[PDB]
Amino acid sequence: DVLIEWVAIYPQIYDILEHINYVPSNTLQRLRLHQPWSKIDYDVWFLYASDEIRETCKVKYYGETKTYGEVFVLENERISQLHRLFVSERAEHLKNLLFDALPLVELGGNVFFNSHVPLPCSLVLTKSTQENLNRITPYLVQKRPILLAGPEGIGKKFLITQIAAKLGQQIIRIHLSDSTDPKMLIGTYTWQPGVLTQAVITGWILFTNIEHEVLSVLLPLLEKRQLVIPSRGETIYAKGSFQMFATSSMKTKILGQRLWQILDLTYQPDECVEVVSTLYPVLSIICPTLYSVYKDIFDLFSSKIYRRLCLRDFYKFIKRVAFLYHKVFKEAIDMFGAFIPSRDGFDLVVRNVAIELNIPPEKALQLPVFQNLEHNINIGRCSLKKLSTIRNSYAFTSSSLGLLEQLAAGVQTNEPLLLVGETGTGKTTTIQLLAGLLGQKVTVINMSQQTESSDMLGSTLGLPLHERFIDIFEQTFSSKKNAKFISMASTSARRFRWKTCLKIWKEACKLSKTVLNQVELRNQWAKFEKEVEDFEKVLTVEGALVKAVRSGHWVLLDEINLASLETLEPIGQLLSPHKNFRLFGCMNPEPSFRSRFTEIYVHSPDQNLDDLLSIIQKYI
Amino acid sequence: LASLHAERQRCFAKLNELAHTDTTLMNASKVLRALQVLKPILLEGSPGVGKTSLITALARETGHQLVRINLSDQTDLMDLFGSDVPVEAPFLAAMRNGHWVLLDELNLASQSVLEGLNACLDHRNEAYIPELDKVFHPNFRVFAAQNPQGLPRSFINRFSVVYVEALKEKDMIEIAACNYHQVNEDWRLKIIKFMFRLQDNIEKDISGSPWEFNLRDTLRWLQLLNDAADYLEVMVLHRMRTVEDRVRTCELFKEVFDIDYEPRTIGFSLSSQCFKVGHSLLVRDQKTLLDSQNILQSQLPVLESVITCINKKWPCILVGDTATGKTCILRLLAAIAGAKIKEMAVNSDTDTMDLIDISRKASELFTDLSQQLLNIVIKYRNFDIFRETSLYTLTTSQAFTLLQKVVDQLDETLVHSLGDIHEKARKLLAEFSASPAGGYLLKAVEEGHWFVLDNANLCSPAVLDRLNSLLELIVNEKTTEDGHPKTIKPHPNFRLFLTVNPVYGELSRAMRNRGVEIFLLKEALTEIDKKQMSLLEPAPISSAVDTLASNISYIKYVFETMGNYMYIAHAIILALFSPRQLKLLRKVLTLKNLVQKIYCADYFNHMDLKASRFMDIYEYPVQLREVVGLIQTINDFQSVILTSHLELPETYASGLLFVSAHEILDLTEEVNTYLLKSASAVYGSTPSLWNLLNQFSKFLIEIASSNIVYKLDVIRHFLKLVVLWKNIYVWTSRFYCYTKMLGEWMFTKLLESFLPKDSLEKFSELQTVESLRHYLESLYKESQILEIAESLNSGKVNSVMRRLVSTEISN
Ligand SMILES: Nc1ncnc2c1ncn2[C@@H]1O[C@H](COP(=O)(O)OP(=O)(O)NP(=O)(O)O)[C@@H](O)[C@H]1O
Ligand SMILES: Nc1ncnc2c1ncn2[C@@H]1O[C@H](COP(=O)(O)OP(=O)(O)NP(=O)(O)O)[C@@H](O)[C@H]1O
Ligand SMILES: Nc1ncnc2c1ncn2[C@@H]1O[C@H](COP(=O)(O)OP(=O)(O)NP(=O)(O)O)[C@@H](O)[C@H]1O
C-alpha cells in the first residue's frame, strides 16, 4: 500500500515486496512504474508524448491535490529530500519499520528479502571478511552489477558463494573464457535452451575470467535486466534476483564503467581462527604452529622458489593433517615441501619442520608394498579401497615406492597433483599405480596440441551426399553425352568448393522441372531439389574432461609445462558433481595453475646402483 | 609530398636533359593516354574518390557502355563466364559486346576469379582453363578499380596503372561554383583556402588521429552556409579533441579568416513544439524512449553540434573517448525528439549479413500489436471490453492463444486502421500450423526509428564499407527474390548515429572521410555537476524532458539563485527568465516578493513596442518562430551585435531604464531632510529642490513609457542621469554644484531635457564628480550580476551583456 511512499527511498527491497504482491493506483502507478523497461498500457499519458498531451494531461492527487502532469517537479524534489535524509546504520531499521503492514526479511550486512530458502552456509568468518561483507552488503542491496578485485587467494569466489548461501540463491558460476561462443550465453541453431539465458529466465549468477567482444553480448543485460535473444526475438524480463556478479583483479573492461567495482581485503593471520573454525578437532594451535611452519618455509624460500605458500596451501596442509588426525605428523608437512628439486633443500625443509616439531626422526625421512586383496592398497601409511579390480611390471624400487605412496596420499585426499621430471615415466608410474590400485580409466589427455577448447568443450557432410544424389538424378533425367560438361562441372565444383555447386543443383532442378516410372522420379527430382535448397540455405561436441567427470576416469593431463592459457581447466579444478575423480596431471620441467595443484616432484627412479637390477629382473 | 611535383620537374629536368572540371580533365587526359595501349586500366589513386573519374568519362566517350562489375567475395568464375545450361552474364556480355567494364574491388576477390580475370586480360580472344576453354567485341577495354590497399603481383603487373590525383584549389573553387548561390564568394574562397591550409599545416606538426580534412568537408561547409562565419568553425573544429590543438586551430582561423573565435555560448531553450540550443532547433514532435538521464548542461556545447548534425541528415558520429558520456548524448537528443533509439553493438566481429521460428514471428506480432494499440490509444483515447485484455495478452510454439487475439481483432475506422496491419498479420498467423523455412538496420531503415551503432570502433572495415554504400538514400539488399534490388528509400527519420571510443582502433579513413566527426570531453560545470550528481541534493536545474516542469524548475532555481541595490537585480532577473517563464513566475505568485509588483508592471509595460522593435529588429535577421529565449537571444546574435547595430543590446538596457525609472518614480511619489523640507514646501520656506526633483522625475517617467522613446547607446547616457538623480536624492548648500552636474548630463530630442531645462532654470531663478563613483559602482555590480546570471544561462563566464558592459567599463 502506501509504503511505496518510501518506494525508491531505500533500495528495491520495497520493490521486491511489491513483486510478492502489488497492484496499481493513480499516483502509485504514476510512481513505481517508471522503471527502465516495461510497457505501460494503464496510464500511457506519461510515455505517449511530451506535447500538450503529456504536457497538459493531468495528475491525480499529487500531494493529495490534483495538479497536471508536471507534478513530477512536485515530486522530484520531494523524493530528493528523502534521498538526502537517508544519508543519516539504522537505515534498515527504518526500512523494517517501514514494512509495518512479516515476509522473509533477511538481515545480513544490511538487509535483504529473497524469499526462496536458506542454504548450507559453510564459509563463515568474523574478520576482514566481515568488513568485506560490509563492503558488499550495500550494492547487493542496491542490485547494481558488482565486481571484486582484491589480491589473489582471498576466497572471493568463496566469499560470493557463501554470500549467496546467506541468500536463497544458487550461484551458477560460468567461467567465461576467450574461446566462448554465444551458446552458454544463449544457445544456437543450425533454437537452443541456453545457460545464461536460463539463469536470466529462472533468475543470482556469477562469472569469472572476465578480464581476459562477447562482453558486449552481456552488455545488454548490464544496461537493463534483459537480453538480445536474436533468433526467438524476445528480450527477457529478469524479474527475480538476477544479480550478475563477476570476478577479476584488474580494471580494463566496460564493466569498469558499467559495474560498481569494489575492493576486498583479507588479514591472512585470521586463517588461524578460520581452520580452527573449520576443523573442529584441530582446536590445538599445532595448527597455528603449522602456520608458523609455513612462515618458516617462506623464510627458507626467502634453490629457486617456484612455489608460494598460501592460505590455500595452508588450508590444504590443514586438509592433509585432518586426514592424518583420524589416527606423528612430521611426515605430513614432510610431504608439504616435497616440491623441492634439491634433496638438500628437502632436508632443510625437514630441519625447519623438526624445529617446529619435536626431536629428530630422520628414520621417517628415508622410510612397504601393499595389502592387496579387497581394499586392495595399503602402501605407506595410506590405504585405498580400490574398486572393480582388473590387475604388468609391478612394485619397482624404493624410489617407486615413495612416489607411489605420495600419489596414494594425494589420491586419498581428492586434491590435484602433478610430477615434473625428465623421463616421461611419471605417467608410467601414474598408470602403474592406477591399475595397481584398481585402474579407473587412464584418460591420458596429452594437453599440448589441442590447445584449450578440445579438452574442455565443443562441414561437408551433406555435400558429398547431395553430389551422389544429383549425379544419380542427372543420370536418370539427362543423358551421358548430353549433360556431359554439366556433369563435369557438377564434379569439379564438388571437390570441396561446396557453394557454387548450389547453382549446379538449382539450374539442374530448373531443367528437371522443365522435363515435366515417371511421377516417382518426378518426386525424386523434386525432393532432391528441395533438399538442395535447404542445404543452399544452410551453406550460407563432448569434452574429454567432461566425459571423465561424468564417467570416472583418471584425468592424466600430461605436458602442462608446454600448453597455452587453457585456465578454464584450472577453473574446472576450482569447481571441486563427482564421486571419485583423478586429476593426476603430469608436468615435465604458470603462476596460478601451478600454484593450485599439490605437486610432488619425481626423483628419477633409476639411481640406487642396484635398483636397476630390480627393473632389469622384471624386464629380463 | 608536393616536392615530388618539384622532383617531377627534376624528373622533367632529366627529361629535358634527354631533350567535367580542370584537374579532372587532367586525370581524364591521363586515362586517355592510358587507353592507347591494349591492357586493363587500373586507378592507382588515393582514397575518397571512387570511380566517378571513370564513371563520367564514358558519357564523353563514343557510346561506351559502363559495365560496373562490382567484383566481390561471393563471386564465382561461373558468375563471370556463365553459359552452363543443361541441354535437352555481365562480364560475358562485356566479352561479347564491347564496353567499358568497370571492375570494382579487385582486392576483395577470390583468388581463382582473380585467375579468371588474369586469363581474360589478354589482347587476343581468351582461352580460359578454369571453366571452359575460351570466351572470345574487339575493343572491350576493361577498367580496374585499384581499391584501398593485396592484389597479386602478376595481376597487378599485366594491367596498366593510372595515378588518379587529387583536386586543385582553383579547381576546388570551380567545384564550389555549383554551391555559390547562397555564398559570399570571397567567403567561399576563404573557406576553401582555410580547409586547404588547415590540412597542409596539420600534416606538419604534433596536432591524435590521421586528420583527413578533405574536400567533402569543404563542400559540406559550403552547403551548410546556405541555411542561415561561426557555425562553420563550430562544426569544423569541434572535432579537434586535444584542447591545445583547438587553440592552435582557432589561431589558424584568425590567420586565415581574420576574426576572433570567441565561443558562442549556447543555451537550452526547451519549449513544447521545439527544443533548441544555439543556432540550432529541433522538431520536437509520439515519444518512445521515456528516458532516465538528465540535460547535462556542460554537454550543451556539443549536444548542439550533433543536433545540427541530426537535422542536416549528415552521418552522426559521436566519436571520442570512453566514459565521457556519449550514449547519453544521443539518448537525450533522440529522447527529447522521441526518435525511438535502438542500438547495435557492432564490435563483436559482426558481419555484413548481421546488419542487412513460428514463435519469433508470433512474438514480433504481439509486440507490434502492442505498439499499434499504443499509438491508437494516444490520439482517440476511448477504447477499453476485452480489448484491454487483448492488450494484456499482447504483452504476455504453443501460440494458439494468439488466435484468440485475432478474435479480438475480429470484434470503426480507427479500428479499421489498426486492423489493416493487425487482421492481415493475424490472417497470415492462421498459418501457425504450417511449413517453415527458418534485418538489423533494415528494420530501422524501413521504419522510422533512430539507429545507434554503439561501441563501433572495431568490428570490420568491410561492414562499415557496406554501411557507407548506404551512407550516401537507396539500399541494395540481397534478401530479395531474383533480379531486383528494391532499395528502401524511407530514410526520413532514419539516422546512422555511430558511437566510437579511442581505446580501440579508430574508425577507418573512409567512414571518417564520409561523416560528421564530433568529439566529446569532460568539463563538469557548476549547475551541471549540481544536477548530474543530484541524487543527494534536492534539485536539478532542468529536471525533466517536459517543458511545463522545466519552467517551474528553473524558475524555482534562479529566483532562488539571487543571493540602491535591487535595480539591476530585478532588471537582469526579469531579463533572463523566459517570456513563458515570465507568465509562469506571475502564475507562481525578500526581493522576489517585490518582483510580483515588477511582474504586474511588466505585463503592463515590459516590452509594449519594445517587443515591436524586437520583432522588426529580430525579423530582418534570420530568427526563430516564437518567443522562447531572451538573454539567449541577446547572446544569440553574437556576431550580429558584434556588427555594432546593438538592436538586441539596446532593448536590454531599455529594460533597465524602465525598471530604474519605476524605482525613481515611486521614490518621487514618495516625495509627493532638506529635500523633505522642499517637498513639504510644495504645500524652511520657498522650495527650489522639490520642483528640481519632481520635474526631472517626470522627465524620467516620460523617458520610460513614445515612438522615439523606442528609438532612443544613448540610453546609457540617460541612465547616467538616472544614477545621478539617485545620487542627488542621496546627496540631498551644494545645490548649485549638483544643479551644474544635472546640467552636464543634460548637456550630455526635445522634451526629456526640456523638463530638466525648466526645473533647472527655476532652481537657478532661486539661485564633486562623485556621480562617476556610484556610476562605476553600478556598472561593476551589474557586471557581477551579469556573470551570475550568465551562469544560469549557459555556464561560461562571458556574455554579450558582459562584453558590452566591459567596453562600457572602458569609459
Ligand atoms: N570465511 C571463510 N570461511 C571458510 N573458509 C574460508 C573463508 N575464507 C576463506 N576460506 C577458504 O579459503 C580458500 C580460498 O581458496 P579458493 O576460494 O578455493 O580459491 P580462490 O581463493 O577463490 N582463488 P580466487 O577466486 O582467485 O580467490 C577456500 O578453500 C576457503 O575454504
Ligand atoms: N610401479 C612400477 N612397477 C614396476 N616398474 C615400474 C614402476 N614404475 C616405474 N617402473 C619402471 O620404470 C620404467 C619406466 O620407463 P619407460 O618410460 O617405460 O621407458 P621409456 O624410455 O620412457 N619408453 P620409450 O617411450 O620408448 O622411450 C620401466 O622400466 C618400468 O618397468
Ligand atoms: N544527462 C546525463 N545524465 C546522467 N549522466 C550523464 C549524462 N550525460 C552524461 N552522463 C555521464 O555519462 C555516463 C553515461 O554515458 P556513458 O556511459 O559514458 O556512455 P559511454 O560509456 O561513454 N559509451 P562510451 O563512449 O563507449 O564510453 C553517466 O554514467 C555519467 O557519467
Task: Give CA angle at B532 (A222, B335), nearest 5°.
Answer: 65
Distance, in Å, from the CA atom of A187 to the CA atom of A323, rounded to the nearest integer, reads: 43
What residue ranges in A397-447 does DSSP mark as E strands?
442-443
Distance, in Å, from the CA atom of A594 to the CA atom of A591, rounded to the nearest integer, reads: 6
Quick check: B503 and B319 in contact, CB under 8 A? no
From A585, A580, A598, select the one nearest A385 (Cα to Cα): A580
Distance, in Å, from the CA atom of A442 to the CA atom of A581, rounded to the nearest integer, reads: 11
Around B222, how many Cα atoms within 13 Å sit in the side-chain half-sphere? 28
- Cα A382 to Cα A295, A361, A563: the distances in Å are 27, 19, 33
Q: What are phi and psi of A92, to 5 degrees?
A: -70, -30
Biggest distance spanned by C-alpha atoms of chain B: 134
3-state secondary structure of B40: coil
Buried b (16+ CB within 10 A) or exposed e, A194-222: bbbbebbeebbbbbbbbbeebbbbbbbbb
Q: Which amino acid is at A474?
A: E
Q: What are phi and psi of B717, to 5 degrees?
A: -70, -35
3-state secondary structure of B415: helix
Kindly identify the ligand whose nearest atom is closest to the C-alpha of A268. Answer: 1
Quick check: A501 and A493 in contact, CB under 8 A? yes
Is the Cα dihedral B90, B92, B97, B98 positive or negative?
positive
Distance, in Å, from the CA atom of B713 to the CA atom of B731, rounded to the nearest integer, reads: 27
Cα A242 to chain centroid, rounded: 17
Pairing of strands B160-162, B41-43: parallel
Burial of B511 (0-12, 13-18, 19+ CB in 10 A): buried
- How far is ligand 3, taken at its centre, from the CA of residue B523, in Å? 13
Distance, in Å, from the CA atom of A137 to the CA atom of A144, rounded to the nearest integer, reads: 12
Asked if B287 and A54 come within 8 Å (Cβ–Cβ), the reply is yes
Is the Cα dihedral B784, B786, B791, B795 positive or negative?
negative
Q: Please check whether residue B670 touches A, CB under 8 A.
A: no
Distance, in Å, from the CA atom of B225 to the CA atom of B534, rounded to the nearest integer, reads: 40
Around A287, how many Cα atoms within 13 Å sit in the side-chain half-sphere? 24
Residues 290-349 in B contacting A (C-alpha not used; CB under 8 Å) = 290, 292, 322-323, 336, 338, 345, 347-349
Task: Report the gap between the CA of A526 and the closest CA in chain B (Å).
Answer: 16
- Which value, in Å, is the radius of gyration of the alpha carbons in chain B? 36
- Verify whether ligand 2 is closer than 6 Å to residue A393 (CB atom): yes
- Cα A428 to Cα A527, A605, A617, B273, B426: the distances in Å are 57, 11, 18, 83, 69
- Cα B226 to Cα A278, B181, B221, B281: the distances in Å are 80, 8, 9, 16
- Verify whether ligand 1 is closer than 6 Å to residue A560 (CB atom): no
Range A178-184, long-range pairs (CB < 8 A, 24+ positions): A178/A212, A178/A565, A179/A452, A179/A453, A180/A214, A182/A214, A182/A217
In which element (H, E) is residue A50 found?
Answer: none
How many residues belong to chain B?
811
From A46, A76, A49, select the one nearest A58 (Cα to Cα): A46
Other Cβ atoms closer than 10 A to A490: 20
Kindly identify the ligand whose nearest atom is closest to the C-alpha of B518. Answer: 3
Distance, in Å, from the CA atom of B483 to the CA atom of B360, rounded to the nearest integer, reads: 28
Q: What are phi and psi of A558, to 5 degrees?
A: -90, 155
Resolution in angstrom units: 4.0
Non-local CB neighbours of A85 within 8 Å, separated by 6+ positions: none
Cα A235 to chain centroid, rounded: 25
Q: Which amino acid is at A161?
A: T
- Verify whether ligand 2 is closer than 6 Å to residue A574 (CB atom): no
In which element (H, E) is residue A107 found?
Answer: none
How many residues belong to chain A?
620
Distance, in Å, from the CA atom of A530 to the CA atom of A469, rounded to the nearest integer, reads: 12
Non-local CB neighbours of B10 within 8 Å, separated by 6+ positions: none
Residues within 6 Å of ligand 3 by CB: A 257; B 293-294, 296, 299, 322-328, 332, 455, 499, 501, 532
Non-local CB neighbours of A486 within 8 Å, separated by 6+ positions: A474, A478, A504, A508, B84, B85, B86
C-alpha cell recorded at residue A298:
617462506
- How far is ligand 2, taken at its centre, from the CA of residue A612, in Å? 11
Is the Cα dihedral A511, A517, A523, A528 positive or negative?
negative
From B477, B472, B268, B252, select the one nearest B355 (Cα to Cα): B477
Quick check: A330 and A353 in contact, CB under 8 A? yes
Other Cβ atoms closer than 10 A to B410: 9
Pairing of strands B275-276, B269-270: antiparallel
**Residue in chain A lying closest to B546 (CA):** A50
Q: Which amino acid is at B269?
A: S
Q: Which amino acid is at B196?
A: F
Quick check: B114 and B25 in contact, CB under 8 A? no
Alpha-carbon dihedral of residues B648, B653, B655, B658, nearest 10 degrees? Answer: -150
Distance, in Å, from the CA atom of B529 to the CA atom of B782, rounded to the nearest integer, reads: 26
Distance, in Å, from the CA atom of A615 to the CA atom of A603, rounded to the nearest integer, reads: 16
Non-local CB neighbours of B434 within 8 Å, separated by 6+ positions: none
Distance, in Å, from the CA atom of A512 to the CA atom of A521, rounded to the nearest integer, reads: 10
Residue with cell 535448397: A533
Burial of B524 (0-12, 13-18, 19+ CB in 10 A): exposed
Non-local CB neighbours of B667 within 8 Å, separated by 6+ positions: B697, B729
Distance, in Å, from the CA atom of B423 to the CA atom of B5, rounded to the nearest integer, reads: 70
Residues 486-505 in A contacting B (C-alpha not used; CB under 8 Å) = 486, 489, 493, 499-500, 503-504
Other Cβ atoms closer than 10 A to B604: 10
Distance, in Å, from the CA atom of B811 to the CA atom of A505, rounded to the nearest integer, reads: 92
Is the Cα dihedral B330, B335, B341, B345 positive or negative?
positive
Asked if A72 and B544 come within 8 Å (Cβ–Cβ), the reply is yes
Distance, in Å, from the CA atom of A376 to the CA atom of A435, rounded to the nearest integer, reads: 11
Q: Please check whether residue B73 touches A, CB under 8 A.
A: no
Q: Please check whether residue B85 touches A, CB under 8 A.
A: yes
Q: Which residues of A are annotated as a binding site?
A: 150-157, 421-428
Residues 19-48 in A contacting B (C-alpha not used; CB under 8 Å) = 34, 36, 39, 41, 44, 46-48
Burial of B591 (0-12, 13-18, 19+ CB in 10 A): middle
Distance, in Å, from the CA atom of B166 to the CA atom of A210, rounded to the nearest integer, reads: 48
Task: Report the gap between the CA of A186 and the closest CA in chain B (Å).
Answer: 15
What residue ranges in A427-494 does DSSP mark as E strands?
442-443
Kindly identify the ligand whose nearest atom is closest to the C-alpha of A370. Answer: 2
C-alpha cell recorded at residue B235:
562544426
Of residues A54, A77, A500, nearest to B76 (C-beta): A500
- Kindly give the number of the ligand 3 atom that is closest to the alpha carbon of B327: 19
Other Cβ atoms closer than 10 A to B720: 17
Quick check: B147 and B70 in contact, CB under 8 A? no
3-state secondary structure of B87: coil
In which element (H, E) is residue B162 found?
Answer: strand B160-162
Is the Cα dihedral A465, A468, A472, A477 positive or negative?
positive
C-alpha cell recorded at residue B48:
575518397
Distance, in Å, from the CA atom of A359 to the CA atom of A376, rounded to the nearest integer, reads: 34
Burial of B649 (0-12, 13-18, 19+ CB in 10 A): buried
Nearest CA to ligand 3 atom 12: B325
Q: Please check whether residue B751 touches A, CB under 8 A.
A: no
User: What are the residues facing A417 on neighbouring strands?
Assistant: A584
Name which of B287, B371, B391, B531 to mutate to probe chain A: the one with the most chain A Cβ atoms within 10 A of its Cβ.
B287
Task: Report the gap between the CA of A511 and the closest CA in chain B (Å).
Answer: 7
Name which of A40, A73, A504 to mutate to probe chain B: the one with the most chain B Cβ atoms within 10 A of its Cβ.
A73
Asked if B536 and A47 come within 8 Å (Cβ–Cβ), the reply is no
Task: Report the gap between the CA of B538 and the closest CA in chain A (Å).
Answer: 5
Residues 449-488 in A contacting B (C-alpha not used; CB under 8 Å) = 474, 478, 482-483, 485-486
Residues 63-102 in A contacting B (C-alpha not used; CB under 8 Å) = 68-70, 72-73, 76-77, 80-81, 83-84, 87
Of residues B131, B287, B547, nearest to A48 (C-beta): B287
Q: Please check whether residue B546 touches A, CB under 8 A.
A: yes
Q: Please check whether residue B549 touches A, CB under 8 A.
A: yes
SS (HEC) of A376-406:
CCCCCCCCCCCCCCCCCCCCCCHHHHHHHHH
From A262, A177, A162, select the one nearest A212 (Cα to Cα): A177
